[PDB]
Design a protein. Structure first.
Length: 157
């Protein structure tokens, strides 16, 4: 169903994450981690303290798709196990995946983001915030990921 998903997204904040390659998203999906440039790191840390859920929605540049979405489970921290990103960096955020399935941009064409001049939600720099209603509807468009159990995510809220 979609009910636990809606509960997790209630009053969440949403951020568009743009990755230059698939390898980094694959690493994030396998290890449950993300890292971003300091300007976005500071914004995500502020959001994590201020909201019940902070949701990252991932898109690989040139792919024409989103690759899934995840919820922050920590602020950024240094000194952990190093991650061999493919680089073109601040701390590491732990994340719990909510959906690991892809969504083509063709299916999000009816959603515009008020915080980016009402451009289609697919358009945005890495770290662009997505307004609550746009972000909720975007997450609800993804195919259901029946491999994930949101019971444990709910307990971290």
């Amino acid at each position: 169903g979609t009910s636990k998903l809606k509960y997790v997204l209630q009053d969440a904040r949403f951020f568009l994450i743009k990755s230059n390659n698939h390898e980094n998203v694959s690493l994030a999906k396998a290890k449950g981690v993300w890292s971003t440039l300091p300007v976005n790191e500071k914004k995500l840390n502020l959001a994590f303290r201020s909201a019940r859920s902070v949701i990252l929605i991932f898109s690989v540049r040139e792919s024409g798709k989103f690759q899934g979405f995840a919820r922050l489970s920590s602020e950024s921290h240094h000194g952990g196990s190093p991650i061999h990103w493919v680089l073109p960096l601040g701390g590491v955020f732990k994340i719990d995946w909510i959906c690991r399935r892809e969504l083509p941009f063709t299916k999000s064409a009816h959603l515009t983001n008020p915080w980016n001049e009402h451009k289609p939600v697919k358009i945005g720099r890495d770290g662009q915030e997505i307004e609550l209603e746009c972000g909720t509807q975007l997450c609800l468009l993804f195919p259901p990921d029946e491999s994930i159990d949101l019971y444990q995510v709910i307990h971290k809220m």
